[PDB]
Amino acid sequence: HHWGYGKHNGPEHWHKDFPIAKGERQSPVDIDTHTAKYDPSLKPLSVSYDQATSLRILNNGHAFNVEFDDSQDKAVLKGGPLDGTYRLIQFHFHWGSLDGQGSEHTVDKKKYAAELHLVHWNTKYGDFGKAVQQPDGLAVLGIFLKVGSAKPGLQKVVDVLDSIKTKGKSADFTNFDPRGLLPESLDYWTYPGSLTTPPLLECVTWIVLKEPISVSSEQVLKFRKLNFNGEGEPEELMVDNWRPAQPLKNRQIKASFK
Ligand SMILES: COc1ccc([C@H]2OC(=O)NC2=O)c(OC)c1
Ligand SMILES: [Zn+2]
């Protein structure tokens, strides 16, 4: 597969290799704040990242992934809409060429400058590859980024980016604390959806935080210096690595808050 985000291989083309692109629970979606309903049954959300062990950062040609040791329950997400225990495996971002776009989810059609995805898998399926074949296999925590004041907890990530400019490059990235990327509030919207890139599997419980985090223009500018291409290939800046909003179909978005 040669999928990407260009005119010739971007989201509008994905359905030819990945027909589930036109399925019934595709992501991202627009979150219409006037139609999402508060759900009193949602249990409290539990983000337990104190024992998180980051290992590595990888430019995969689509984004950069900060990977974690998920061989044990070190950093987990529970509660909210979730049954059981979901283990953190990696986080990454989607961002724009300009500050007015870059997020995958939208809020009343608003596009944020970027969106962080913290990806976790359901430990009852044993491994991540099995989990992505299940409707409740993954829980993705999605956090919007707006451009304003710098996020101090992001700066170790931005500073390593020069070392992984091109596709296939990785770097050691130990001791990074993902709690520094969270907003103050854990108020969220939740709905059933999918992976937002190929293979587009319909295996995700989406948990999208209402409160965005602020990053500086300098921080996001450094994201935009990455490359989709590999070393020694023609330079294509890693920008606009987001899929647009997909049809909601037969789904309800629930709010954790009133
Ligand atoms: C192999 O594991 C994957 C594959 C794709 C996605 C895409 O779905 C998403 O929401 N962002 C993505 O890059 C993923 O993240 C959950 C994890
Ligand atoms: Zn993502």
Short mmCIF file of all heavy atoms in Angstrom, two decimals, residues 9 20 30-31 70 72 128 150 155-156 166 188 223 227 232 244 249 254:
data_model
loop_
_atom_site.label_atom_id
_atom_site.label_comp_id
_atom_site.label_asym_id
_atom_site.label_seq_id
_atom_site.Cartn_x
_atom_site.Cartn_y
_atom_site.Cartn_z
N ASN A 9 -2.89 10.12 -3.44
CA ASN A 9 -2.94 8.94 -2.59
C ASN A 9 -3.59 9.20 -1.20
O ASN A 9 -3.56 8.33 -0.32
CB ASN A 9 -1.54 8.39 -2.39
CG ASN A 9 -0.68 9.31 -1.52
OD1 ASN A 9 -1.06 10.44 -1.23
ND2 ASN A 9 0.51 8.83 -1.16
N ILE A 20 -13.52 -0.62 3.76
CA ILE A 20 -14.11 -0.20 5.04
C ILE A 20 -14.00 1.31 5.24
O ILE A 20 -14.70 1.83 6.11
CB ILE A 20 -13.49 -0.95 6.23
CG1 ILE A 20 -14.47 -1.06 7.42
CG2 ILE A 20 -12.17 -0.29 6.61
CD1 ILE A 20 -13.96 -1.95 8.53
N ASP A 30 -17.28 14.98 12.98
CA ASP A 30 -17.63 16.25 13.63
C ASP A 30 -18.37 15.94 14.92
O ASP A 30 -19.33 15.19 14.94
CB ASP A 30 -18.44 17.12 12.71
CG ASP A 30 -18.70 18.49 13.34
OD1 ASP A 30 -17.69 19.19 13.69
OD2 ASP A 30 -19.93 18.85 13.43
N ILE A 31 -18.00 16.65 15.97
CA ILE A 31 -18.69 16.59 17.25
C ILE A 31 -19.59 17.80 17.31
O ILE A 31 -19.13 18.96 17.47
CB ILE A 31 -17.72 16.53 18.43
CG1 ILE A 31 -16.77 15.32 18.31
CG2 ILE A 31 -18.48 16.60 19.74
CD1 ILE A 31 -15.58 15.40 19.27
N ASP A 70 4.74 -1.75 26.65
CA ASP A 70 3.42 -2.25 26.95
C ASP A 70 3.45 -3.76 27.25
O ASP A 70 2.48 -4.45 26.97
CB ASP A 70 2.43 -1.95 25.78
CG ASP A 70 2.77 -2.62 24.47
OD1 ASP A 70 3.94 -3.07 24.27
OD2 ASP A 70 1.85 -2.70 23.65
N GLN A 72 3.65 -5.02 30.15
CA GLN A 72 2.92 -5.08 31.45
C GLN A 72 2.04 -3.87 31.62
O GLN A 72 2.26 -2.92 30.93
CB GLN A 72 3.86 -4.96 32.62
CG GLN A 72 4.78 -6.10 32.78
CD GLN A 72 5.56 -5.90 34.04
OE1 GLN A 72 5.10 -6.29 35.12
NE2 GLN A 72 6.67 -5.19 33.94
N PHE A 128 -1.78 -6.34 20.85
CA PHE A 128 -2.36 -5.25 20.09
C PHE A 128 -2.91 -5.78 18.75
O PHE A 128 -3.98 -5.37 18.30
CB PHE A 128 -1.29 -4.20 19.86
CG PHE A 128 -1.72 -3.07 18.95
CD1 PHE A 128 -2.28 -1.98 19.49
CD2 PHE A 128 -1.65 -3.16 17.57
CE1 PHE A 128 -2.72 -0.93 18.71
CE2 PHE A 128 -2.11 -2.11 16.75
CZ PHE A 128 -2.67 -0.99 17.33
N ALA A 150 3.28 28.20 24.98
CA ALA A 150 4.00 26.97 24.87
C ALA A 150 3.53 25.94 25.94
O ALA A 150 3.18 26.28 27.06
CB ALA A 150 5.52 27.21 25.02
N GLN A 155 8.05 20.03 25.01
CA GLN A 155 9.29 20.53 24.40
C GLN A 155 10.30 19.40 24.22
O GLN A 155 10.98 19.40 23.19
CB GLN A 155 9.92 21.67 25.23
CG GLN A 155 11.03 22.46 24.49
CD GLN A 155 10.55 23.07 23.16
OE1 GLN A 155 9.40 23.53 23.01
NE2 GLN A 155 11.44 23.06 22.18
N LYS A 156 10.34 18.39 25.10
CA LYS A 156 11.30 17.28 24.84
C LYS A 156 10.97 16.56 23.53
O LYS A 156 11.87 16.08 22.86
CB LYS A 156 11.37 16.32 26.00
CG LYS A 156 12.07 16.98 27.18
CD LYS A 156 12.09 16.07 28.37
CE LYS A 156 13.01 16.61 29.48
NZ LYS A 156 12.79 15.85 30.74
N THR A 166 13.16 12.08 8.69
CA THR A 166 12.67 11.38 7.50
C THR A 166 12.09 10.00 7.89
O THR A 166 12.44 9.40 8.94
CB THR A 166 13.78 11.23 6.48
OG1 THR A 166 14.99 10.77 7.09
CG2 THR A 166 14.03 12.56 5.83
N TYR A 188 -15.03 14.87 28.57
CA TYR A 188 -14.87 14.25 27.26
C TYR A 188 -16.19 13.98 26.55
O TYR A 188 -17.28 13.91 27.14
CB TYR A 188 -14.05 12.94 27.43
CG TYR A 188 -14.74 11.85 28.18
CD1 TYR A 188 -15.64 10.98 27.57
CD2 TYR A 188 -14.54 11.71 29.55
CE1 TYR A 188 -16.28 9.98 28.29
CE2 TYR A 188 -15.15 10.71 30.27
CZ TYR A 188 -16.04 9.86 29.65
OH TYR A 188 -16.74 8.90 30.36
N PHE A 223 6.97 20.70 14.19
CA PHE A 223 6.29 19.53 13.67
C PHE A 223 6.32 19.60 12.14
O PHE A 223 6.52 18.62 11.47
CB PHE A 223 4.79 19.43 14.05
CG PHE A 223 4.44 19.02 15.46
CD1 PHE A 223 5.36 18.97 16.48
CD2 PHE A 223 3.11 18.77 15.77
CE1 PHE A 223 4.99 18.67 17.76
CE2 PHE A 223 2.75 18.44 17.05
CZ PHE A 223 3.70 18.33 18.03
N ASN A 227 9.50 15.29 7.56
CA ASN A 227 9.31 14.88 6.21
C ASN A 227 8.50 13.58 6.07
O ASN A 227 8.71 12.65 6.84
CB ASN A 227 10.69 14.57 5.60
CG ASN A 227 11.49 15.77 5.14
OD1 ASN A 227 12.52 15.58 4.49
ND2 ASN A 227 11.04 16.95 5.37
N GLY A 232 17.20 11.19 1.46
CA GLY A 232 17.72 11.27 0.14
C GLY A 232 16.66 11.24 -0.94
O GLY A 232 17.01 11.10 -2.09
N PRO A 244 -10.29 14.01 7.01
CA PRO A 244 -11.45 14.81 7.35
C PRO A 244 -12.55 13.95 8.01
O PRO A 244 -12.55 12.71 7.98
CB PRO A 244 -11.92 15.38 6.00
CG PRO A 244 -11.32 14.52 4.99
CD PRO A 244 -10.10 13.88 5.58
N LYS A 249 -23.49 8.50 10.57
CA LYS A 249 -24.36 7.34 10.41
C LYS A 249 -25.18 7.07 11.64
O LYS A 249 -25.70 8.02 12.25
CB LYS A 249 -23.57 6.17 9.87
CG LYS A 249 -23.01 6.61 8.51
CD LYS A 249 -22.53 5.49 7.64
CE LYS A 249 -22.47 5.79 6.15
NZ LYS A 249 -21.33 4.98 5.61
N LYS A 254 -21.67 10.81 23.12
CA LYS A 254 -22.08 11.03 24.51
C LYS A 254 -21.11 11.96 25.19
O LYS A 254 -19.94 11.87 24.91
CB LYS A 254 -22.19 9.69 25.24
CG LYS A 254 -23.32 8.85 24.66
CD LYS A 254 -23.32 7.49 25.27
CE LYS A 254 -24.10 6.50 24.43
NZ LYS A 254 -23.47 5.25 24.83
#
